[PDB]
Design a protein around this nucleic acid. Structure first.
Lengths: 96, 94
DNA sequence: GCTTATCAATTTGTTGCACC
DNA sequence: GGCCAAAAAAGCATT
DNA sequence: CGGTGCAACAAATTGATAAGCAATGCTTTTTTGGC
């Protein structure tokens, strides 16, 4: 799978950044998206997609193994809505 | 926060990497991620989340505006699953 | 209006990547 | 970096 | 640059409830590139 290491490697090759800064830019990139989200802000990355926050009320759940009814607690979660551009680039992909 | 605002926030912070460099880097990373998915490969960033492709079977859909039938072939769509650190940090509730 | 995703608790096997 | 108009992408309707 | 250990991660499982989407023209936002 694509990893932080691979992404850093690409920044090194493609933009000639130092391996030290490439490594830090990648980490900063994801951290900056996390920070915005923990701050309740929507992240919209044109050409890729949106990371949105949804507040979910409590609802019925259970222990799949057994069957003990357990309420899925209220929570705010992160969802990703891929844009149309990315959707098109991927619709005919083939899982490696 | 838009893509350009992300670039500005990054640029500011670390005053030891050129603004233009950050612009190029961010754009390049996103293309790298996009192309990875277009290639049918997964993305796995610990603490942030992982991206993969979910299959959608062919089906007889409809133009919801006219009700006309439309034959849709099988396809793949991106799917994102938030990692632990992102889940916890984003979830304000208890 | 129909299809796909969310999630609970728990186990088994896996891996990104921080740390040496 | 700001301005501005044109283009690209996304948003909306409803999706 | 490379070896290692382990928290984070994938997959499975059941079922009530929530989220997402087929087509497409018009509107709105964001990007792009010259000054």
């Amino acid at each position: 799978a694509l990893t932080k290491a691979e992404m850093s490697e690409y920044l090194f090759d493609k933009l000639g950044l130092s391996k030290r800064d490439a490594k830090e830019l990648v980490e900063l990139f994801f951290e900056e998206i996390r920070r915005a989200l923990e701050n309740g802000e929507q992240v919209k990355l044109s050409g890729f997609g949106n990371f949105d926050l949804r507040d979910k009320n409590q609802r019925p759940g259970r222990n799949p193994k057994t069957g003990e009814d357990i309420p899925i607690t209220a929570r705010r979660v992160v969802t990703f809505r891929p844009g149309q551009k990315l959707k098109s680039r991927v619709e005919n992909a083939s899982p490696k | 926060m838009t893509k350009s605002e992300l670039i500005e926030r990054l640029a500011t912070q670390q005053s030891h990497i050129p603004a233009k460099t950050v612009e190029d880097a961010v754009k390049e990373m996103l293309e790298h991620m996009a192309s990875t998915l277009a290639q049918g490969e997964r993305i796995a960033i610990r603490g942030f989340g992982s991206f993969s492709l979910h299959y959608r079977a062919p089906r007889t859909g409809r133009n919801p505006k006219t009700g006309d039938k439309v034959e849709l072939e099988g396809k793949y769509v991106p799917h994102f699953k938030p990692g632990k650190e992102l889940r916890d940090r984003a979830n304000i509730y208890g």
